[PDB]
A paper describes a structure:
In at least nine instances, this regulation is direct—a hallmark of an emerging class of proteins called metaeffectors, or “effectors of effectors”. Through detailed structural and functional analysis, we show that metaeffector activity derives from a diverse range of mechanisms, shapes evolution, and can be used to reveal important aspects of each cognate effector's function. After release into the host cell, translocated bacterial substrates (effectors) regulate one another through several different functional interactions: indirectly, through counteracting modification of a shared host target, or directly through either steric complex formation or direct modification of one effector by another.
To define the mechanism of LegL1 inhibition of RavJ, we first solved the crystal structure of the N‐ and C‐terminal portions of RavJ spanning amino acid residues 1–228 and 251–371, respectively. Despite no identifiable sequence similarity, the overall fold of the N‐terminal domain of RavJ resembled that of papain‐like cysteine protease family members. Comparison of RavJ with its top structural homolog, human tissue transglutaminase (TGM2), identified three conserved residues (C101, H138, D170) along with another adjacent residue (W172) as a putative catalytic site. The N‐terminal structure contains a structurally conserved putative catalytic triad (C101/H138/D170). To determine which of these structural elements are essential for effector function, we tested the effect of their ablation on yeast growth. Strikingly, single substitutions in each of the four N‐terminal catalytic site residues, as well as the C‐terminal loop mutant, abrogated the yeast growth inhibition of RavJ.
Residue numbers in the entry: 0 to 228
Amino acid sequence: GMAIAPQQIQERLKQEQYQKFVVADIGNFPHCLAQTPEGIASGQRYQKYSTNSLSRTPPFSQWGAPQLLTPKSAQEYIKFAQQRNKKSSFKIDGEAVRVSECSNFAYHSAGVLLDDPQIRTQYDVAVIGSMHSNGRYLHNITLLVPKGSRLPQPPEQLTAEVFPIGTLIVDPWAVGMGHPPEQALAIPKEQFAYNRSLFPATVNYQSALDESLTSTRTGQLTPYTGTPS
């Protein structure tokens, strides 16, 4: 039968409620913040988080101010999603606090996607540094590439002419920043909120090159919410 469709992948990512995260660097990127109810809410949520004493306790302290992190195995991405979805006593507006930012948020979605068995047989997963600025890549993004694809490896850059047909972009930070799923969660580049800063990019992880992938269990994650009927 048919493989898993973009719509079902997007629905799986919607279950994570990425718009509800505390986006710890929201104040650094006003130009990336959508004027939507979600964007307004995210701005206010960060205000409440930032000066709450619990934001300066682990792991919140570390989630809000990350050291360079470059996961190189599928299981690390799955664990990243699992750890960020743990609910602790720290709540804002009655909602358990989860925290991420422009660099590492994409790792959560890489874990969600790597944990799905029907994604495994239809797409390879990659994680790229994007939003290039003065030799730095400010923003990591997750990609779904059709099976068979090999993206350039550093120091070669990823550009449009080596971006495979059928690639889907996954950017949970964009959703934290108020953009809708249709601009961020498993969509083509023409639909992507930050499509003028997508290229050039650097490819930091390719599941197609990860020898540990096959022994990485699927179904490890519980979706953060269940889709409403």
